[PDB]
Amino acid sequence: GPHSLRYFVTAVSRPGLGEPRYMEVGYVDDTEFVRFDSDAENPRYEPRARWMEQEGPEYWERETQKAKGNEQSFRVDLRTLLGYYNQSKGGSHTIQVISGCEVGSDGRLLRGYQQYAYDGCDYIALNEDLKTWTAADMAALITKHKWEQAGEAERLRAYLEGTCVEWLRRYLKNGNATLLRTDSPKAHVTHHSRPEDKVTLRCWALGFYPADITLTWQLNGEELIQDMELVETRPAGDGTFQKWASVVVPLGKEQYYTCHVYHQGLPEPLTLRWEP
């Protein structure tokens, strides 16, 4: 399979209540491995995964500084967008960054990216050629012009082509036993009453990794994606995920609906109908 390093960084002003909240979370494949939070007691990059303890003192101080630097940068960023959008100093605003790179199993760059948004909406994002920028609106068009002038894009391609892929590689190895594992899902179905002589069949899938999975309800050779109802796959609080999908069938004929679970740890999909 392919893998990826993923940063989720947030800045958010709180006028009247001091400097902004700046946080940074880092993910190698659905596995949280790093965190920074300017609201901590002693704000410092901290491990979120045993395999990141391995890293020595130097790493943690470098990340913690370039983090503190980014924090400062978004303080500036936040005032700047105030002017751009002609917004008044008195409100609370958010900047968001998604940054990282995915690679293939040969370990080569597959794709890189860095995306910014302000107050929820897209602002500006590096295109896939790792050269151009796509601006969301004319405000983020100024930022664009700034960054073409400052060779920020070719500077980012050095980080993406280089730093990012080479540490993803690092991480995948440091933590091969964790990141490269495969927990198969265990599944069941629950039954629930409903007015009008109808019945709800929920198919649960639990304790699995990676997060990617598919559940379908079938009936005599055709899926019912439309008359289904699922929940986004979710973290279960221990580095595993779970998902459930339900379907409304008529009482007496629930025996004929079957559930299907597709996943990396499932050589063959799972098929289950009900526990009368």
């Binding site: 967008l81 500006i124 730093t163 990012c164």
Partner: peptide, 9 residues
């Protein structure tokens, strides 16, 4: 060397 040195807008 892990996370990015973020630019100002």
């Amino acid at each position: 060397k892990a996370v990015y040195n973020l630019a100002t807008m």
